[PDB]
Design a binder for this molecule. Structure first.
Ligand SMILES: *[C@@H]1O[C@H](CO)[C@@H](O)[C@H](O)[C@H]1NC(C)=O
Lengths: 160, 45, 48
């Protein structure tokens, strides 16, 4: 019952055992990190305008993907110990692997695309930026959502 | 990858996906020699 | 014949008691269908 604009607009303040609440602030290292990631990459999806900005913007994005990579794993973890249930906890540890790695794989790659935006040869590299960022932005929200309800699914498993 | 991309892209359709992400069904009918397709003209008593 | 994109077709079937002469008869051919197919027709070949 808390104003958080997730996918399809579902809004919550998880009502379960306090570790699931702790899987709501530690997951707010992700739940607040996802909905911020899909807003600044949303600023880079087409408001990408400057090669000079492309250098450090992708870096902050890459550090945010890197931030997101080890945030989504950090959200999917603590519930699985307080999870009375096992079946609904499988996805989170998978997402703790899958969502982290998929974010991780681009988190480094965004850096190798931030370095290519570092020097900033706007003749072609911006077309690199525009193609993976949306690809990532499509991938990150896809990866977000898959965890974004699998991370609460473990918190749901961690209810009692 | 890495400056090389498939011309494809997968919609990820899961039971939980956002309502704006869930699959939607769309019909687009085109209007446009003899003209044969005609609306039903209702008769009368 | 094809007019106004309508290829009309008229037919008529009458028995034959003659050998090889287009009979000195008289019959009106009548419509069968009015095909609304927009096709140029300049050539035509039969099928047996
Ligand atoms: C006949 O051929 C002409 C070629 O100029 C074409 O424009 C026209 O559509 C054709 N008509 C039909 C009924 O196929």
């Amino acid at each position: 019952s808390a104003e958080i604009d997730l996918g399809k607009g579902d809004f919550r303040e998880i009502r379960a055992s306090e570790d699931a609440r702790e899987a709501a602030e530690a997951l707010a290292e992700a739940a607040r990190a996802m909905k911020e990631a899909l807003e600044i990459i949303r600023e880079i999806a087409e408001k990408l305008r400057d090669s000079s900005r492309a250098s450090e913007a992708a870096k902050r994005i890459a550090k945010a993907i890197r931030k997101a990579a080890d945030a989504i794993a950090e959200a999917a973890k603590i519930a699985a110990r307080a999870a009375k249930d096992g079946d609904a906890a499988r996805n989170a540890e998978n997402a703790a692997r899958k969502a982290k790695e998929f974010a991780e794989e681009q988190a480094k790659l965004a850096d190798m695309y931030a370095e290519l935006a570092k020097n900033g040869d706007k003749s072609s590299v911006l077309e690199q930026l525009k193609t993976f960022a949306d690809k990532a932005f499509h991938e990150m929200e896809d990866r977000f959502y898959q965890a974004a309800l699998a991370v609460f699914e473990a918190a749901e498993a961690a209810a009692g | 990858g890495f400056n090389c991309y498939f011309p494809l892209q997968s919609y990820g359709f899961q039971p939980t996906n956002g309502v704006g992400y869930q699959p939607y069904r769309v019909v687009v009918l085109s209007f446009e020699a003899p003209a044969t397709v005609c609306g039903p003209k209702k008769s009368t008593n | 014949k094809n007019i106004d994109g309508y290829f009309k077709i008229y037919s008529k079937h009458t028995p034959i008691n003659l050998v090889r002469d287009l009979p000195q008869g008289f019959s009106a051919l009548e419509p069968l269908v009015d095909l609304p197919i927009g096709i140029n027709i300049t050539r035509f070949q039969t099928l047996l």
